[PDB]
Every structure is written in C-alpha cells, then in structure tokens.
Amino acid sequence: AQNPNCNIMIFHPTKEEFNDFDKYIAYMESQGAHRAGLAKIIPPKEWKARETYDNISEILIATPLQQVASGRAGVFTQYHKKKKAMTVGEYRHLANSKKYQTPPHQNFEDLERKYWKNRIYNSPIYGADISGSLFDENTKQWNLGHLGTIQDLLEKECGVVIEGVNTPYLYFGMWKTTFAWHTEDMDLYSINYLHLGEPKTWYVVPPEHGQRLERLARELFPGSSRGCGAFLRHKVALISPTVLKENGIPFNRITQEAGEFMVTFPYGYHAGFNHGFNCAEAINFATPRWIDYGKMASQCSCGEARVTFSMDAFVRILQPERYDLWKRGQD
C-alpha cells in the first residue's frame, strides 16, 4: 500500500504532466496521496494563473463575515456575523490596519503558536464564499473555472442526467480568519489555489480515520452533537493540534503559499487559518472513485447546514432513502 503513514505529499508536475487534470489526480492517488486527505501541487515554472493581480480592487464582497468565537483557546465554535458590503480594496486596507494586521513573528511555527493562543480574543472579518474566478480565460491548464462538472461525472458514471451547475468561489482572507473542521458537501474533492498574498495553514485528518475526529467532536461539543447527528456539516467547530494530539487523533499540517494548489480528497476532514491578507479560489470536483463516498456521506437534516441547489440531485440519486428527511431540513 502506498503512503501507509498517510503523510501529506507534495507534487511538482512538469508542463506536460499539467495538461490532463484528471490523469494527474489519478497519478497522485496511485502514489497514495489521498490517504493523507490533502496534497499540495506546485505548478511548473512555465505556468501562470493570470498576468497580474493589479486590477482586482473593485470586486465586491457583498457580505463580509465577522467570525466571533466562543469557548476555550483550543476548543471553540465560531459564528458568522454579517457586515456591510465592501470592495476588495477596502477589505485589503482593513486587513492591513493596526486592529487586524498580522503581528510580528519569527517564522510560520511562531505564527501558528500565536494563532492558537490568541484567536478566540479577536473577531477577524472573512470575505468568503464569493461566486467568481480570477483565472484568465486563456489559462488552459488547472483553470478552476474550466474543470469537468460534477453533474457530468455523475452522468458519466451512473448514466443519469441531472440538473445543476458547478462554479468556483473566491475567498478574501485576513490574519486569523478561520475555516472550521469539515469535509466537503457529499464528501466531494476540493481544489484550492492561493492566488495572492499571505499563506494559509491547513490541518487534515486521513479519510480512514475521519470517524475518530467525529467521536472527539461529539465529546467536545456535546450540546451541538445532541442537536444534530452530523453537526460538523455546520462548519463552526475548531479543535487545536494540541488537543488533537492529547486525544490521539491522527492528523497532519502544512502551509500553502501563493502560487500553490491544495487538493482535499473525499472524506478528508480539514481546518485552518490565514496568515494575513490573501485571496484563494476553490471549487468542488468528482472522479470515479468519489461515487462510493458520495453514496455513504453523512448528512445534516436539522436545518442548520443549508447548501446549494446542486446538492439536491446528488442526494436524490445517490441516497434515495435519506432524500425525504434531508429535503425537509432544506425547507
């Protein structure tokens, strides 16, 4: 078995190897990359996403989210308080202000220490989940707006045509902005490109050990767990690396820098934080190997998780027994 310790793997495809996206994912999996739940892909030196980032300041962040924490430094939840609209240029200025800017630090490990010590005492503002793309239309390789759609993949594998569309999302971050522990909708893959700015640190649990994280989460968030049998789908719970190690949960960590891709694999729980002002693009995708994960994915039916239009058909076709309950949760 390749990669039996479930380490995060880093790949350096050549320009030739960068042509065929699906082929390269399958190659990474042949080397055991999926066992980690997360891989890094450094693009060939000949590649670029677009020419410059000089003209992005007028993008609108219609609903910036202030991420308010509750709990203790290593075990907390966050809620999202909606703020007034602002442009990317306004948000960048806010991220760089004394109130929000990254503190002085020695290296990524020192900043990580500071994050986990102090995150809860601040409420950073996250420009998350903005439909759109920063890839140039002329970028032919690894262009996250030109991937094969998940509806086409399901149709190809299973023979059933379904409604729905699959488009990317932009994330404008600042110091301490946080993504809570989660797997993707329907335990899909994700791919994330860090277009510009400061790094993003990731934590990940191997898919074969995801249920160990779920059991810890139920213990640590006992009210949330009574409320919903899949409450990590709410995307509000944080647990630090120190707490995971104390509880024997297998995990890994890595820092993504501008110009790098990350891929999350089906049922790979992940969480993390941004170092300072940045902009990432991400989208979900599927392969043949995903179908079995999609058929077994948990679902939230309590009402909280509320998701896109396109998840309806995935539940309907892959999980017909669960469909009626899940849809009630949507309504």
Ligand X SMILES: O=C(O)CNC(=O)C(=O)O
Distance in angstroms (rounded) separating the CA atoms of residues 161 and 139: 29
* Least Cβ distance, residue 250 to Ni ion (angstroms): 19
Residue nearer to ligand X on the CB measure, 256 or 301: 256
Q: Which of 274, 273, 317 is CA-nearest to residue 297? A: 317
Q: Which of 125, 227, 108, 235 is CA-nearest to residue 175? A: 125
Q: Verify binding: residue 264, ligand X, rule CB under 6 A.
A: yes
Q: Verify binding: residue 256, ligand X, rule CB under 6 A.
A: no
* Least Cβ distance, residue 59 to Mg ion (angstroms): 5
Cβ atoms of residues 138 and 48 within 8 Å? no
Residue nearer to Ni ion on the CB measure, 67 or 86: 67
The answer to whether 200 is annotated as binding is yes
The answer to whether 23 is annotated as binding is no
Q: Verify binding: residue 282, ligand X, rule CB under 6 A.
A: yes
The contacts of residue 212 (CB under 8 Å, 6+ apart) are 205, 248, 249, 250
* Least Cβ distance, residue 331 to ligand X (angstroms): 26
The answer to whether 270 is annotated as binding is yes
Q: Which of 85, 163, 173 is CA-nearest to residue 127? A: 173
Q: Give one DSSP letter per residue of 277-295, joined into a string.
A: SEEEEEEEE--TTHHHHHH
Cβ atoms of residues 183 and 232 within 8 Å? yes
Binding residues among 61-120 for ligand X as defined by CB under 6 A: none
Residue nearer to ligand X on the CB measure, 183 or 224: 183
Task: Output the six-digit token pair for 99.
Answer: 């109130």
Give the x-and-dash track for 203-222 against ligand X (CB under 6 A): --------------------
The answer to whether 228 is annotated as binding is yes
H or E element at residue 65: strand 65-72
Q: Which does 58 bind (CB under 5 to 8 A by kind): Mg ion, ligand X, Ni ion, none?
A: Mg ion
The contacts of residue 104 (CB under 8 Å, 6+ apart) are none
Q: Verify binding: residue 58, Mg ion, rule CB under 5 A.
A: yes
* Least Cβ distance, residue 179 to Mg ion (angstroms): 25
Residues that bind ligand X (CB under 6 A): 128, 171, 179, 190, 192, 264, 270, 280, 282
Residues that bind Ni ion (CB under 5 A): 190
Residues that bind Mg ion (CB under 5 A): 56, 58-59
